[PDB]
Amino acid sequence: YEQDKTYKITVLHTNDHHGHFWRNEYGEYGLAAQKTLVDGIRKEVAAEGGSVLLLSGGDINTGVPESDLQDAEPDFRGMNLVGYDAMAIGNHEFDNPLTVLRQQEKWAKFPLLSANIYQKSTGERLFKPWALFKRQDLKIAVIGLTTDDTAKIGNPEYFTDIEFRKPADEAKLVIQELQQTEKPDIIIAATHMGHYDNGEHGSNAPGDVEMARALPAGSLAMIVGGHSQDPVCMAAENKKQVDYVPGTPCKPDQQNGIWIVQAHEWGKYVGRADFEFRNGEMKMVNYQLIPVNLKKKVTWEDGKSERVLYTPEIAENQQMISLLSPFQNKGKAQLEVKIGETNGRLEGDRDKVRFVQTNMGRLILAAQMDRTGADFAVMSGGGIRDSIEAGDISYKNVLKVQPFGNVVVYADMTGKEVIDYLTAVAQMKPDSGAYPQFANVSFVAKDGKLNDLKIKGEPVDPAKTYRMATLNFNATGGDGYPRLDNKPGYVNTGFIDAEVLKAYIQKSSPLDVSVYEPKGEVSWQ
Ligand SMILES: Nc1ncnc2c1ncn2[C@@H]1O[C@H](COP(=O)(O)CP(=O)(O)O)[C@@H](O)[C@H]1O
Ligand SMILES: [Mn+2]
Numbered sequence: 001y002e003q004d005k006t007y008k009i010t011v012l013h014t015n016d017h018h019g020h021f022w023r024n025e026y027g028e029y030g031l032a033a034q035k036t037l038v039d040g041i042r043k044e045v046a047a048e049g050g051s052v053l054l055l056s057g058g059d060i061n062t063g064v065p066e067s068d069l070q071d072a073e074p075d076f077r078g079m080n081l082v083g084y085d086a087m088a089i090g091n092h093e094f095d096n097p098l099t100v101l102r103q104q105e106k107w108a109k110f111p112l113l114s115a116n117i118y119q120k121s122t123g124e125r126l127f128k129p130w131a132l133f134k135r136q137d138l139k140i141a142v143i144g145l146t147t148d149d150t151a152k153i154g155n156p157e158y159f160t161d162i163e164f165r166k167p168a169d170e171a172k173l174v175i176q177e178l179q180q181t182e183k184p185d186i187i188i189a190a191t192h193m194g195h196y197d198n199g200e201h202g203s204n205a206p207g208d209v210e211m212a213r214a215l216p217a218g219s220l221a222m223i224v225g226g227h228s229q230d231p232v233c234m235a236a237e238n239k240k241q242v243d244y245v246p247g248t249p250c251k252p253d254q255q256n257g258i259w260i261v262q263a264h265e266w267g268k269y270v271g272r273a274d275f276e277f278r279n280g281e282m283k284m285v286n287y288q289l290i291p292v293n294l295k296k297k298v299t300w301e302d303g304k305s306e307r308v309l310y311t312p313e314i315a316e317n318q319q320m321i322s323l324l325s326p327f328q329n330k331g332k333a334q335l336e337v338k339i340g341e342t343n344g345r346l347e348g349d350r351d352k353v354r355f356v357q358t359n360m361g362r363l364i365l366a367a368q369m370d371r372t373g374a375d376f377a378v379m380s381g382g383g384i385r386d387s388i389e390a391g392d393i394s395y396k397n398v399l400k401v402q403p404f405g406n407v408v409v410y411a412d413m414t415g416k417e418v419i420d421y422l423t424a425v426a427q428m429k430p431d432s433g434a435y436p437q438f439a440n441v442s443f444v445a446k447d448g449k450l451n452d453l454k455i456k457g458e459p460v461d462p463a464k465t466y467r468m469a470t471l472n473f474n475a476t477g478g479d480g481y482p483r484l485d486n487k488p489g490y491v492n493t494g495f496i497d498a499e500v501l502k503a504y505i506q507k508s509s510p511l512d513v514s515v516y517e518p519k520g521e522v523s524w525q
């Protein structure tokens, strides 16, 4: 590099896009506005003589029906237009078969990176570990890392010959290899690992903070993250702000001389890190999370309430709107048609379905039992991703509640097995994707044991055979559920979760939420 020359480098980042290529119902975010925002930063930076690098923390897949149904083609094509330089592979890029992910690499004009994912039978990486970029005369390496919780919380069928090695260890190896073979001036890691205050990851796989502390001091200028879906803005040393407010200052975390950033989720913000490089020294000189047309509510005495922008409106790029509209409207009529109605709200909120039994759990499981002739059922609360408001119901609503394309399966088992299976599942704790939603099951759990266990009001008979329904995801060991696929009596029906729920709603409509209300059949103490 030129001695004593100060270089200006701006790193833009987003993460956990989750199918949000289009603006929402209140005109927030979307890639059209993102494109306008980024184009503008590039003009400003070019005029001040600097460089720009735009990175994604991954998890582009899953979260919006229009995107989900099209394997996120609109999202990757949209990201090509915004101009992403690289992306870390997130766990949700494995929600589909590898062929789909490979197709996404074809679509993406930017590399999808991950240094720690290997094919077990060959001991070789399935993706590129890093990418090198040239800005002015500097060499910048971007390494990609994916949480090793991926096979632990994803669909087991896709990982039979794939292994996620510990990210922090992989990073140590890669940084060493880069410093000895490539000698980049700056090294950045795009990761899908999660930011946990003070490295307190708990039951989750270790994330960015623990990695930064384990790496050589300042060996990375920055870690651009994701997965935990947080705007990483520090309120105090080692404490992220709770309820961060758009448009306010955001101090990224810094651990062992390495900055850690994250832009929450869904294109809500474009994070902007302004650095200045001089004689090997990387100084972050400014940082901010730029809201993408986010809004707040204000209330008039009139009783009227309306949504107001936090910052000046960002215009939607027309070229992007033209590129995305065809995807946005594909099959629009069908997705929106009425399939039934509900006299009450069906609770699918994360702070409910992963903590207590909800009528949405009861409803989904009822559809599954109905289709399979099962006696009882269970599924992970993490498998419920939205609610259904009182009123009419469209297929689009169903696709929001169950977006993974899991398949309904069933298993005939003995009472002894029912008791052991349910005892193990009853051990999954609240505040976890693994927390179980049960149907036709009742018991009182104390000291890792089930008291009063009943299936449909009747005590379990060890000798009798029962049939339970669930998703292939849980049956194959997903979320750490006891495997059932390696037991006799298991059957994969091939029926798509969403299609089963839709068909059930249709014939059962109008729905009386009273019939699906949890009455404490299952308890814990
Ligand atoms: N492909 C998939 N099929 C079924 N359930 C899935 C799934 N991907 C995620 N889940 C559910 O979602 C949970 C993970 O949600 P988290 O918020 O903890 C991490 P992430 O989904 O945001 O990357 C899993 O424990 C599981 O219950
Ligand atoms: Mn995510």
Ligand SMILES: [Mn+2]
Pocket (backbone or CB within 6 Å): 059, 090, 091, 092, 192, 227, 228
């Ligand atoms: Mn994730």
